[PDB]
């Protein structure tokens, strides 16, 4: 039996508490002690980042031959899959030994152990034989004089940082990239009129302009050819300012028949005079008119100027505007097309291609842990801390400070409401980070997942969605493989007994549907607030509170009905450019982020409470809320 990969949903908790002055100690003592914690936090970031800078040079490069360094790369990241299960030592200790050999902190002697394959031994030699940058020599010169336990922690935190951020995202991207290429080739074979020559022509036009966006914010080629003042980008709501203004005038100051016919009578008036109006509206018109000239900032003189008596604005907002001139970008495109009338025909088809197939999905780039976002925490393990939950005091032994000696702090007491009380768990480690200038400590302890009735992991359902079937065009294949995996690993008759909560998120109201097998059993109230309310892409993140709070309601309702499976709805696919006022593409982008966040929190909690999660595609319809029940039938594949 070849050993299995570590879980991604970890069976562990960290409770974070503010570090406080210990009662009877000067603000100055605290400050000097907090200064020592800050220096150790920053040194730990420097050390992990240094290890990452060294390790990341051996990442496999897409579509290239495996380097001889690759086995060491794979092992550093996930040592457990290459070691014997009956190893007397931990994968963490084995990683330490491989790292020391590969970095020349030690020799290959430690690697004579049969725990290590020859492939590993050979890969580690290949790493050690390479010249080291000055930076790596400085890092290894420093780490050589650390205690083994601190080096082990460093290696573990760097390896886990790289594996969990970069490597998962890189593996998701590779499959996304591979399938995008197959979908591109098929779309091009099915639309052969968009030849390479034509694509190139448009590509060069959009480079010459300076359009780096997939989705071009430019009037259609053919609208642009009409040669009128009609852009959909220049105004507010695809009309001039005056057209918007007149609409407020018509709601605020006009009444009865005047709301309809004032525009018409004003143009009749301007061209042919008051006596051209019906006798019975001359009176009201006089008043409506001098009011009109005041609410807009218009003179009757200059209005008589245009086309023999015409108002310089639309009469409705429900019509294409002729007073809304084209943006400078609309006009440059128009200039490019005028010397290329051959391209006009293919404008729309080329923009469809450009939105999907001009740019490959972005290959992830390695990111270092951020000090300001406290991406990582300094680890104090077995003989480097003490905790007294009676007097809420903690001792933290810095790296070179002797055994039994601690810097001592109080901390915000463990809440009584917080379910694992210190006495019903064991603290394996304390984790130090800073939020701004303020020190925080995390008490780390193990909580096993409740066992699911499904003999399948959430990690398998995620791999189906992210690797096996990554494209939107593969949604149907994703849902079919997920349903099949879930039905085949449910112990009984899934179609009669599988307990499922469906919750419809987004522009489908706050309703949930409980199913037993394929049978809709009960609809349940669910009090969610929408993304419209509660109002460095931001830092006023009240999404996090929105996500945690709304996640908790979904989980309570699921647990209350001994649910096996939570089915979520993803957010509506992205509309085509134009009829997207800048503001509403920001608000659709906040929705997507916030909803991503609710799904992740519900998933993490669900796996802890012995459940599984599946996110179905946005309910595509072609006036009451049946939506959660429809979502469940979509899962079962009746719709
Ligand atoms: Zn335009
Ligand atoms: Zn208009």
Structure tokens at 82: 């290459």
Q: Which residues contact 45 (CB under 8 A, 6 or more apart)?
A: 369, 371, 376
Sequence positions preceding breaks in the chain, C–N over 2.5 Å: 535, 622
φ/ψ of 415, rounded to 5, equals -55, 140
| C-alpha radius of gyration, the chain, whole number | 33
Measured distance CA(128)–CA(326) in Å, rounded? 62
Asked if 427 and 380 count as a contact pair (C-beta separation under 8 A), the reply is no
Asked if 394 and 408 count as a contact pair (C-beta separation under 8 A), the reply is yes
Q: Which residue has the tokens 């080629």?
A: 221
HSE, side-chain direction, 13 A CA sphere, residue 465:
14
List the Cα angle 341/347/349 in 5-degree steps.
Answer: 140
Please tell me the distance between residue 276's alpha carbon and the centre of ligand 2 in angstroms. 26
Q: Mapping DSSP to helix (H, G, I), strand (E, B) and coil, where does residue 68 land?
A: coil
Please tell me the distance between residue 241's alpha carbon and the centre of ligand 2 in angstroms. 8
Burial state string for 33-45 with b = 16 or more CB within 10 A and e = fewer than 16: bbeebeebbeebb
CA neighbor of 457 nearest in space, from 1, 10, 2, 73: 10
Q: Which residues pair with 262 in a beta bridge?
A: none
Q: What is the DSSP secondary-structure string of 313-373?
A: S-S-SSS--SSBPPPHHHHHHHHHHHT-HHHHTTHHHHHHHHHHHSSPPPPP---PPPTTT
Of the ligands numbered here, which is closest to the C-alpha atom of 577? 1
Q: Which residues contact 593 (CB under 8 A, 6 or more apart)?
A: 537, 543
Measured distance CA(78)–CA(293) in Å, rounded? 75
Q: Which residues contact 417 (CB under 8 A, 6 or more apart)?
A: none
Measured distance CA(166)–CA(573) in Å, rounded? 26
Q: Where are the alpha helices (DSSP H) in 191-226?
A: 196-208, 221-225
First to last CA, the chain: 42
For residue 575, what are the CA distances in angstroms to 184, 426, 570?
20, 51, 15
Please tell me the distance between residue 250's alpha carbon and the centre of ligand 1 in angstroms. 27
Return the number of other C-beta atoms located less than 10 Å from residue 541's C-beta.
13
Helix (H) or strand (E) holding 20: strand 12-20
Q: How many helices (H) and strands (E) does the chain have?
A: 22, 12
Of the ligands numbered here, which is closest to the C-alpha atom of 229? 1
Of the ligands numbered here, which is closest to the C-alpha atom of 334? 1
Asked if 230 and 224 count as a contact pair (C-beta separation under 8 A), the reply is no
For residue 194, what are the CA distances in angstroms to 252, 346, 348, 354?
51, 7, 10, 11
DSSP letter assigned to residue 63: T
CA neighbor of 547 nearest in space, from 610, 606, 613, 591: 591
Measured distance CA(287)–CA(292) in Å, rounded? 9
HSE, side-chain direction, 13 A CA sphere, residue 34:
21
Structure tokens at 97: 């030994």
Starting at the earlier edge strand, list the strands of the sheet with 378-380. Answer: 378-380, 429-435, 438-446, 12-20, 407-411, 393-396, 385-388
Of the ligands numbered here, which is closest to the C-alpha atom of 232? 1
DSSP letter assigned to residue 307: G
Please tell me the distance between residue 234's alpha carbon and the centre of ligand 2 in angstroms. 11
Please tell me the distance between residue 317's alpha carbon and the centre of ligand 2 in angstroms. 6
Q: Which residues contact 64 (CB under 8 A, 6 or more apart)?
A: none
Q: What is the DSSP secondary-structure string of 123-190?
A: HHHHHHHS---HHHHHHHHHHTTS-HHHHHHHHHHHHHHHIIIIIHHHHHHHHHHHHHHHHHHHHHHH
Structure tokens at 571: 């957010």
CA neighbor of 267 nearest in space, from 311, 307, 325: 311
Q: How was this structure determined?
A: X-ray
Strands 499-503 and 612-616, by their bridges, are unpaired
Torsion from C-alpha of 191, 194, 195, 199, nearest 10 degrees:
-140
Q: Mapping DSSP to helix (H, G, I), strand (E, B) and coil, where does residue 513 land?
A: strand
Measured distance CA(585)–CA(69) in Å, rounded? 45
Question: What's this structure's resolution in Å?
Answer: 2.2
Q: Where are the alpha helices (DSSP H) in 424-576?
A: 458-463, 475-488, 494-497, 543-560
Asked if 100 and 76 count as a contact pair (C-beta separation under 8 A), the reply is no
Q: Mapping DSSP to helix (H, G, I), strand (E, B) and coil, where does residue 335 land?
A: helix
List the Cα angle 574/578/580 in 5-degree steps.
Answer: 60
HEC readout, 411-425: ECCCCCCCCCCHHHC
Please tell me the distance between residue 238's alpha carbon and the centre of ligand 1 in angstroms. 9
Of the ligands numbered here, which is closest to the C-alpha atom of 234? 1
Please tell me the distance between residue 340's alpha carbon and the centre of ligand 1 in angstroms. 18
Please tell me the distance between residue 313's alpha carbon and the centre of ligand 1 in angstroms. 17
CA neighbor of 44 nearest in space, from 266, 376, 503, 514: 376
Alpha carbon of residue 306 to chain centroid: 52
Please tell me the distance between residue 303's alpha carbon and the centre of ligand 2 in angstroms. 16
Asked if 284 and 296 count as a contact pair (C-beta separation under 8 A), the reply is no
- Burial environment of residue 201 by CB neighbours within 10 A (0 to 12, 13 to 18, 19 or more): middle
CA neighbor of 442 nearest in space, from 404, 414, 476: 414
CA neighbor of 172 nearest in space, from 488, 447, 458, 465: 465
Measured distance CA(592)–CA(367) in Å, rounded? 23
Measured distance CA(263)–CA(246) in Å, rounded? 10
HSE, side-chain direction, 13 A CA sphere, residue 261:
12
Measured distance CA(604)–CA(612) in Å, rounded? 9
Measured distance CA(261)–CA(170) in Å, rounded? 63
Please tell me the distance between residue 331's alpha carbon and the centre of ligand 1 in angstroms. 7
Structure tokens at 566: 């939570």
DSSP letter assigned to residue 236: B
Of the ligands numbered here, which is closest to the C-alpha atom of 245? 2
Please tell me the distance between residue 294's alpha carbon and the centre of ligand 2 in angstroms. 20
Measured distance CA(633)–CA(619) in Å, rounded? 11
φ/ψ of 183, rounded to 5, equals -75, -40
CA neighbor of 40 nearest in space, from 199, 130, 187, 153: 153
Please tell me the distance between residue 576's alpha carbon and the centre of ligand 1 in angstroms. 16
Structure tokens at 74: 């794979």
CA neighbor of 205 nearest in space, from 338, 327, 325: 338
Of the ligands numbered here, which is closest to the C-alpha atom of 331? 1
CA neighbor of 95 nearest in space, from 112, 114, 70, 74: 74
Of the ligands numbered here, which is closest to the C-alpha atom of 238? 2
Of the ligands numbered here, which is closest to the C-alpha atom of 324? 2
DSSP letter assigned to residue 531: S
Question: Between 91-103 and 134-143, two packed helices, what is the crossing angle to 10 degrees?
Answer: 130
Please tell me the distance between residue 326's alpha carbon and the centre of ligand 2 in angstroms. 13
List the Cα angle 329/335/339 in 5-degree steps.
Answer: 150
Q: Which residues pair with 395 in a beta bridge?
A: 386, 408
Q: Mapping DSSP to helix (H, G, I), strand (E, B) and coil, where does residue 491 land?
A: coil
HEC readout, 541-589: CCHHHHHHHHHHHHHHHHHHCCCCEEEEECCCCCCCCCCCCHHHHHHHH
Q: Mapping DSSP to helix (H, G, I), strand (E, B) and coil, where does residue 290 land?
A: helix
Question: Between 582-608 and 543-560, two packed helices, what is the crossing angle to 10 degrees?
Answer: 40
Asked if 169 and 364 count as a contact pair (C-beta separation under 8 A), the reply is yes
Please tell me the distance between residue 584's alpha carbon and the centre of ligand 1 in angstroms. 19
- Burial environment of residue 161 by CB neighbours within 10 A (0 to 12, 13 to 18, 19 or more): buried
Residues around ion ligand 1, judged by CB within 5 A, are 219, 231, 326, 330
For residue 503, what are the CA distances in angstroms to 132, 556, 570?
54, 13, 10
Torsion from C-alpha of 109, 115, 119, 123, nearest 10 degrees:
-50
Structure tokens at 491: 């112990």
Of the ligands numbered here, which is closest to the C-alpha atom of 237? 2
Measured distance CA(569)–CA(508) in Å, rounded? 9
Structure tokens at 381: 């393990």
Please tell me the distance between residue 221's alpha carbon and the centre of ligand 2 in angstroms. 20
Composition of the chain by helix, strand, coil, percent to 5: 50, 10, 40
CA neighbor of 15 nearest in space, from 413, 324, 385: 413
Sign of CA dihedral 104, 107, 108, 112: negative
Structure tokens at 535: 């109002």
Please tell me the distance between residue 209's alpha carbon and the centre of ligand 1 in angstroms. 15
φ/ψ of 621, rounded to 5, equals -95, 150
Of the ligands numbered here, which is closest to the C-alpha atom of 312? 2
Measured distance CA(352)–CA(206) in Å, rounded? 14
Sign of CA dihedral 131, 109, 157, 406: negative
Asked if 75 and 120 count as a contact pair (C-beta separation under 8 A), the reply is yes
Domains of the chain, each with CATH number or no CATH: 1-32+371-448 (no CATH), 205-357 (no CATH), 458-636 (3.30.420)
The torsion region of residue 301 among left (phi > 0), alpha (psi -120 to 50) and beta comes to alpha
Measured distance CA(321)–CA(343) in Å, rounded? 26
Q: Which residues contact 414 (CB under 8 A, 6 or more apart)?
A: 15, 17, 389, 392, 421, 422, 443
Measured distance CA(474)–CA(465) in Å, rounded? 9
Q: Mapping DSSP to helix (H, G, I), strand (E, B) and coil, where does residue 501 land?
A: strand
């Amino acid at each position: 039996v070849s050993p299995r990969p570590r879980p991604r949903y970890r069976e562990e908790r960290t409770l974070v508490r503010k570090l406080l002055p210990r009662p009877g100690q000067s603000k100055q003592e605290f400050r000097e002690n907090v200064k020592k914690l800050r220096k150790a936090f920053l040194q730990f970031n420097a050390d992990v980042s240094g290890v990452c800078q060294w390790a990341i040079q051996f990442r496999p490069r897409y579509g290239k031959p495996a380097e001889p360094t690759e086995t060491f790369w794979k092992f550093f990241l996930e040592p457990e899959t290459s070691l014997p299960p009956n190893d007397s030592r931990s994968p963490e200790f084995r990683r330490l030994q491989a790292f020391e050999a590969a970095a020349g902190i030690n020799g290959a002697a430690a690697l004579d152990d049969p725990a290590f394959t020859n492939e590993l031994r050979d890969s580690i030699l290949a790493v050690a034989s390479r010249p080291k940058t000055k930076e790596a020599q400085r890092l290894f010169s420093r780490l050589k004089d650390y205690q083994p336990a601190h080096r082990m922690i460093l290696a573990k935190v760097a390896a886990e940082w790289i594996e969990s951020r970069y490597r998962r995202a890189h593996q998701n991207w590779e499959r996304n990239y591979e399938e995008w290429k197959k979908e591109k080739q098929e779309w091009e074979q099915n639309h052969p009129e968009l030849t390479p020559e034509i694509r190139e022509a448009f590509n060069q036009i959009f480079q010459q302009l300076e359009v780096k966006e997939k989705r071009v914010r430019i009037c259609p080629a053919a609208r642009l050819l009409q040669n009128k003042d009609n852009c959909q980008y220049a105004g507010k709501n695809k009309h001039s300012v005056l057209c918007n203004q007149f609409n407020e005038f018509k709601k605020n100051h006009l009444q009865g028949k005047a709301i309809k016919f004032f525009y018409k009578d004003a143009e009749k008036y301007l061209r042919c005079g008051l006596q051209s109006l019906k006798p019975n509206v001359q009176g009201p018109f006089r008043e409506d008119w001098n009011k009109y000239l005041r609410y807009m900032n218009l003179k009757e003189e200059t209005l008589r100027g245009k086309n023999g008596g015409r108002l310089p604005h639309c009469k409705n907002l429900g019509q294409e505007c002729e007073f809304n001139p084209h943006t400078a970008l609309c006009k440059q495109y128009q200039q490019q097309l005028s010397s290329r009338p051959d391209l006009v025909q293919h404008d729309e088809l080329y923009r469809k291609w450009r939105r999907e197939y001009w740019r490959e999905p972005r290959k992830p780039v390695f990111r270092y842990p951020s000090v300001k976002r406290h991406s990582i925490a300094k680890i104090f393990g077995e003989n480097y801390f003490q905790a007294d939950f009676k007097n809420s005091v903690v001792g933290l032994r810095l790296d070179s400070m002797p055994a039994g000696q601690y810097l001592e702090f109080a901390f915000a007491p463990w809440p009584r409401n917080y379910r694992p009380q210190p006495g019903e768990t064991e603290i394996s480690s304390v984790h130090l980070h800073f939020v701004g200038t303020r020190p925080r400590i995390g008490f780390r302890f193990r909580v096993p997942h409740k066992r699911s009735r499904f003999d399948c992991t959430q990690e398998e359902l995620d791999e189906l969605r992210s690797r096996t079937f990554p494209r939107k065009a593969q949604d149907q294949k994703f849902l079919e493989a997920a349903r099949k995996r879930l039905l085949e690993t449910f112990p009984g008759n899934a179609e009669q007994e599988l307990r499922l909560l469906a919750v419809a998120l987004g522009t489908d109201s706050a309703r949930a549907a409980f199913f037993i097998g394929k049978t809709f059993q009960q609809a349940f109230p669910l009090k969610i607030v929408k993304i419209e309310k509660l109002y460095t892409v931001h830092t006023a993140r009240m999404i996090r509170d929105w996500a945690r709070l709304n996640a908790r309601q979904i989980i309570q309702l699921a647990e209350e009905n001994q649910v096996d499976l939570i089915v979520l709805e993803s957010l509506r696919g992205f509309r085509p450019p134009g009829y997207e006022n800048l503001d509403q593409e920001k608000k659709r982008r906040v929705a997507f982020f916030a909803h991503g966040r609710i799904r992740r929190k519900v998933t993490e909690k669900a796996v802890e409470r012995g459940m599984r999660v599946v996110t179905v595609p946005y309910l595509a319809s072609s006036v009451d809320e049946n939506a959660a029940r429809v979502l469940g039938r979509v899962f079962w594949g009746e719709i």
